């Protein structure tokens, strides 16, 4: 029961306009998990997250988020570490998704 | 108002 990930912005992205970067992690079990938002491969500090919740199928879900400003060149991603994964799972932010 | 399992058996 590996974590499912979606990485996306709160509002349609526009370069230079302040927004929020979200990483929605769900469908995982057990509940302990490490989720990081990355900027050009480096962990962003002070990322906020929702409190622990679980779905009708028993699996847990969390939202991690931070304020950010989309740019042409900065590469944003979500990195998840979980006991069900053999390695870190990295999902790049794509403003079209 | 949540359930009270205490009035009944544990697993």
């Amino acid at each position: 029961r590996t974590p499912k990930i979606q990485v996306y912005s709160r509002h349609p992205a526009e370069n230079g306009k302040s927004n929020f970067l979200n990483c929605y992690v769900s469908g995982f079990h057990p509940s302990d998990i490490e989720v990081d938002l990355l900027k050009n491969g480096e962990r962003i500090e002070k990322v906020e997250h929702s409190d622990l919740s679980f779905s009708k199928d028993w699996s847990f879900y969390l939202l991690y988020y931070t304020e950010f400003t989309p740019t042409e060149k900065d590469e944003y991603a979500c990195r998840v570490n979980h006991v069900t994964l053999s390695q870190p799972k990295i999902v790049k932010w794509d403003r079209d998704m | 108002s949540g359930p009270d399992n205490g009035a009944v058996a544990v697993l």
Partner: protein
Amino acid sequence: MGPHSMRYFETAVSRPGLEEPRYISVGYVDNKEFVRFDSDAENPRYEPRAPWMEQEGPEYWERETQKAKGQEQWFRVSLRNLLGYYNQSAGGSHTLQQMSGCDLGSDWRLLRGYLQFAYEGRDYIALNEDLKTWTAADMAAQITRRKWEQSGAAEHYKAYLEGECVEWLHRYLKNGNATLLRTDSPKAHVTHHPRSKGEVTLRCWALGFYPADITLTWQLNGEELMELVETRPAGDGTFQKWASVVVPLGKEQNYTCRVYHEGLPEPLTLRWEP
């Protein structure tokens, strides 16, 4: 969308050494969190998570907090019993979960009652729709099932589901009415993306809607047709979703997206606008 509902999602996670498990209880009204208890808090108490719950006085919060203290001990003893049923190593990491709740019918009475448990994220034992019989999911759960059939545990849960669950849900719907009736309609738009030689992806976005219930569709010349993402939180209490289709270059205007949401007087129809 659908029947009014109340749910309590409870979890206990065992911890190492002599440390007691972490216990978390989350309540929902119509799929929105409205109360929470967490044993890891500085002062553990049930707290109002929907602000309309502050209509409840101190006696309410004391009573619910005392109940959570009882649940925490029920989960602790139950985890210890499960360890013996599965002959597992003690002092380890283990998870026990419960879901309970009620859906209401047109007469404000119980439509469907829910009472089920999971161990290590897998079904363990559940009360059937009849609120009289149990479904044991595996062989260890047969031990619990026999014990509970003999002690009449189903009768206790049936009384809670048909009584208290329904009565308190009705009270919360009344107190939360000003918030619970406010809907946020989806704002929709279609984006166009390079796909291949001769093909384009059209993606229909629905953003900033509440409640989460939504339908996104794509039609070709008025006939039904598609990649869908799971509905996801925007982070502000509203939700997002998109639906995309692969379309031949030059035929983009033949496709329409339709968005169905309870906040809308009528469904939205839109197309790619070059």
